[PDB]
Amino acid sequence: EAEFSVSYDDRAIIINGKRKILISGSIHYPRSTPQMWPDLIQKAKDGGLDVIETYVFWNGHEPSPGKYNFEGRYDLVRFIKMVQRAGLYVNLRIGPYVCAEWNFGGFPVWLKYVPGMEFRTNNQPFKVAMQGFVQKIVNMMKSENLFESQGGPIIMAQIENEYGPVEWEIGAPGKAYTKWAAQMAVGLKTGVPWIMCKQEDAPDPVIDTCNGFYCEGFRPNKPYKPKMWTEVWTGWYTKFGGPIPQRPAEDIAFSVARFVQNNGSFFNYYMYHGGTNFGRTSSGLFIATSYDYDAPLDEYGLLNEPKYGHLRDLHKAIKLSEPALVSSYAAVTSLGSNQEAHVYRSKSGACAAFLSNYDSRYSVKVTFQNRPYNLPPWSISILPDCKTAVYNTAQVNSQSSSIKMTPAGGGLSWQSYNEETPTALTANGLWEQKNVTRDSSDYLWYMTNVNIASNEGFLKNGKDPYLTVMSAGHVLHVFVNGKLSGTVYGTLDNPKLTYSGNVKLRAGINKISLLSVSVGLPNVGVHYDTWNAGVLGPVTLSGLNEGSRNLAKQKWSYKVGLKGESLSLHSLSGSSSVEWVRGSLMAQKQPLTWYKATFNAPGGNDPLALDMASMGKGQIWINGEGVGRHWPGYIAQGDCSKCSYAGTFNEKKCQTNCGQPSQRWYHVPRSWLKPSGNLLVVFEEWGGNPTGISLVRRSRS
Ligand SMILES: *[C@@H]1O[C@H](CO)[C@@H](O[C@@H]2O[C@H](CO)[C@@H](O)[C@H](O)[C@H]2NC(C)=O)[C@H](O)[C@H]1NC(C)=O
Ligand SMILES: *[C@@H]1O[C@H](CO)[C@@H](O)[C@H](O)[C@H]1NC(C)=O
Ligand SMILES: NC(=[NH2+])NCCC[C@H](N)C(=O)O
Ligand SMILES: [Cl-]
Numbered sequence: 001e002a003e004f005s006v007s008y009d010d011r012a013i014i015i016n017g018k019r020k021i022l023i024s025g026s027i028h029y030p031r032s033t034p035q036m037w038p039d040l041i042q043k044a045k046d047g048g049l050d051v052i053e054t055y056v057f058w059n060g061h062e063p064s065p066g067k068y069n070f071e072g073r074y075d076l077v078r079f080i081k082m083v084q085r086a087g088l089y090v091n092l093r094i095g096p097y098v099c100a101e102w103n104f105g106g107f108p109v110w111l112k113y114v115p116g117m118e119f120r121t122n123n124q125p126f127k128v129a130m131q132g133f134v135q136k137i138v139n140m141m142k143s144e145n146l147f148e149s150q151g152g153p154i155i156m157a158q159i160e161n162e163y164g165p166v167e168w169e170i171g172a173p174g175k176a177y178t179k180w181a182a183q184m185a186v187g188l189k190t191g192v193p194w195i196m197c198k199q200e201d202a203p204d205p206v207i208d209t210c211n212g213f214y215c216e217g218f219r220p221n222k223p224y225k226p227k228m229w230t231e232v233w234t235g236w237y238t239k240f241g242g243p244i245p246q247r248p249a250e251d252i253a254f255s256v257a258r259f260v261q262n263n264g265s266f267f268n269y270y271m272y273h274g275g276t277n278f279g280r281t282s283s284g285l286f287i288a289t290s291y292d293y294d295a296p297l298d299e300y301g302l303l304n305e306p307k308y309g310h311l312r313d314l315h316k317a318i319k320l321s322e323p324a325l326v327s328s329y330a331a332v333t334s335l336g337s338n339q340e341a342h343v344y345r346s347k348s349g350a351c352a353a354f355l356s357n358y359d360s361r362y363s364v365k366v367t368f369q370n371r372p373y374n375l376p377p378w379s380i381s382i383l384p385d386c387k388t389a390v391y392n393t394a395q396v397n398s399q400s401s402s403i404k405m406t407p408a409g410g411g412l413s414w415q416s417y418n419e420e421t422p423t424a425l426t427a428n429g430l431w432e433q434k435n436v437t438r439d440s441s442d443y444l445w446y447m448t449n450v451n452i453a454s455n456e457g458f459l460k461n462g463k464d465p466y467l468t469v470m471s472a473g474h475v476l477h478v479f480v481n482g483k484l485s486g487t488v489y490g491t492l493d494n495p496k497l498t499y500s501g502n503v504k505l506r507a508g509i510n511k512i513s514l515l516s517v518s519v520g521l522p523n524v525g526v527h528y529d530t531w532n533a534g535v536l537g538p539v540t541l542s543g544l545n546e547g548s549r550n551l552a553k554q555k556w557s558y559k560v561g562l563k564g565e566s567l568s569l570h571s572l573s574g575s576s577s578v579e580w581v582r583g584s585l586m587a588q589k590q591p592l593t594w595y596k597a598t599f600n601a602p603g604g605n606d607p608l609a610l611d612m613a614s615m616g617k618g619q620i621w622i623n624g625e626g627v628g629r630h631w632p633g634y635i636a637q638g639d640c641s642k643c644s645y646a647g648t649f650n651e652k653k654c655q656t657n658c659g660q661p662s663q664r665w666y667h668v669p670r671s672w673l674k675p676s677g678n679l680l681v682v683f684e685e686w687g688g689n690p691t692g693i694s695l696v697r698r699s700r701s
């Protein structure tokens with residue numbers, strides 16, 4: 001007989017023979033640093049979590065076919081072992097489609113270009129690659145007994161991610177792929193359950209699970225499977241150009257209690273720590289570098305009060321109730337028009353009760369077992385012994401905290417290095433951007449010649465012809481004869497672009513150079529991997545004798561990435577290899593400019609950020625390591641109004657920061673610094689003043 005095991009029944013996941021009501025939170029290992037992990041995990045433990053949930057990030061682990069990375073913050077095994085050291089379990093969401101507001105949904109970009117490839121359907125090249133990667137991860141975990149069946153922390157794993165809605169659209173090949181994925185995963189023999197989220201048709205023995213702001217009405221697809229909520233959304237993601245979304249602690253607590261009172265036995269906060277999209281292969285399409293998510297642990301790892309403590313107290317109440325929860329089922333008694341008691345009374349006498357008020361506007365005082373309980377609107381009281389309420393989801397006993405970002409160390413000494421604008425790797429017509437760059441850089445130059453006859457009407461009348469450039473996105477800079485004519489940029493929902501303007505041209509050869517920029521790759525949507533980036537046109541020049549010229553129907557030239565990228569200006573060795581501009585000649589408010597400075601690490605233990613308010617858009621490195629994209633120049637658009645915790649939440653309900661830079665502060669991990677001589681390199685795409693950049697220390701108070 002196995003010493004350790006995981007099974008399940010209609011009531012719960014069963015660990016080493018005992019039913020458990022499992023409290024879980026998401027922490028994505030590459031969204032923080034190995035130095036942070038033990039602290040984050042400890043905070044989760046102290047916050048009442050039994051489980052840490054994480055995706056596996058394929059694109060990070062396999063940057064080219066058969067070449068793997070498990071180093072640094074991609075050391076998945078190290079992360080899993082740290083969770084185990086804290087006495088927590090793991091839900092390993094392998095995918096390898098993970099969505100996750102993460103570049104290309106987790107797929108390596110090279111995968112797209114394998115002959116005969118089609119993503120997320122019953123496609124042979126896809127299935128071979130997917131099976132190979134999932135098998136590799138499973139075998140890595142098994143090699144060190146990391147599944148609970150072997151004494152390790154992993155108690156379940158997920159195959160795919162929210163595939164149900166994809167099948168709905170693509171039909172039978174989707175049904176066939178689902179069946180294949182489930183049987184393939186189960187056949188890897190992990191010794192523990194497999195799950196699929198948002199997958200009503202998940203075949204036995206896979207447990208299908210629920211995601212959302214609320215999941216109280218969800219039931220799995222067989223009565224002998226437990227009821228599990230894989231993503232309790234704790235807020236929403238921040239997009240560049242969007243506001244900062246919040247979700248009230250009282251509403252999260254209500255949603256969790258609503259699920260647990262209805263036989264729910266596993267729930268996981270997405271995110272518990274959200275963290276940061278470091279570098280340039282992390283963020284999904286238009287996703288901000290901050291992945292804060294209004295999580296119980298903020299981007300920097302600090303306690304987000306009062307949410308952290310309010311959920312901590314909810315968890316204590318659930319723990320007090322657990323012996324009753326696992327030895328009975330929820331029995332409903334009506335209390336009033338929109339009020340109920342869900343009671344868990346065991347054969348032995350243990351009793352826990354949940355008293356609910358679903359009215360979003362009014363308080364109701366109910367009588368339960370001869371005692372009065374007042375229930376604020378949209379709240380649930382928990383009585384772990386059916387006698388005394390120890391917690392109510394709308395009564396927050398934790399003190400709130402606000403953010404302070406305090407400058408530290410003052411201003412730095414800057415040097416600059418200019419990018420050049422290249423001019424007319426060629427083609428007759430326009431190529432899609434991912435195809436050309438393979439996502440090796442955000443930047444692709446599209447270049448062409450425009451010949452102008454001496455007899456053009458506009459030349460003799462002193463007017464300018466009219467240029468229209470249409471692009472699939474995501475940012476476009478239009479240069480005409482070496483001069484920037486305009487910049488256009490999209491939104492997450494609409495990344496496509498149109499530049500249109502009068503442009504000055506002369507007799508003979510004119511140069512048009514387009515700098516096309518991606519800002520993370522799409523990560524969700526049926527066939528999202530087929531969506532274009534870059535300039536596919538139409539591209540037209542009107543106001544000519546001929547009428548309008550189709551500029552797509554001529555020779556185009558291509559240049560992948562920036563000169564500074566080729567030179568590795570982000571690194572100490574690369575930046576030191578060239579001479580930079582110093583002194584009063586420092587480039588100011590100039591597009592396509594690299595900046596560098598050296599700084600000493602601030603003392604103490606407060607988390608750190610760069611204040612980038614004086615800058616525009618680009619990328620940041622510290623000691624050669626990518627801090628992430630900056631885009632303070634993208635002002636937050638949306639509706640920001642007072643919200644109440646009460647009533648059905650949606651991601652736009654409690655938005656803040658409207659009309660302000662969508663992200664101003666950029667997280668710098670402490671462990672990336674040395675005491676002295678830290679190299680800071682900023683590529684500035686749009687234009688800024690580097691003198692305004694400072695380090696800040698973050699505190700909560
Ligand atoms: C918790 O689960 C129990 C047991 O499945 C549910 O009670 C059963 O409900 C089904 C209908 O779905 C009935 O056919 C059974 O007769 C019920 N059994 C018992 C012992 O009452 C119960 O509905 C669930 N609780 C809630 C509130 O969802
Ligand atoms: C992709 O680039 C190749 C050259 O490698 C070219 O043959 C093809 O037409 C391009 N397709 C698109 C859609 O850009
Ligand atoms: N307010 C609600 N309970 N809405 C229904 C939630 C649906 C749930 N998230 C699901 O996907 O099945
Ligand atoms: Cl996760």
Ligand SMILES: [Cl-]
Binds near residue numbers: 033034072073
């Ligand atoms: Cl790292």
Ligand SMILES: [Cl-]
Binds near residue numbers: 189
């Ligand atoms: Cl097994």
Ligand SMILES: [Cl-]
Binds near residue numbers: 033036670
């Ligand atoms: Cl760190």
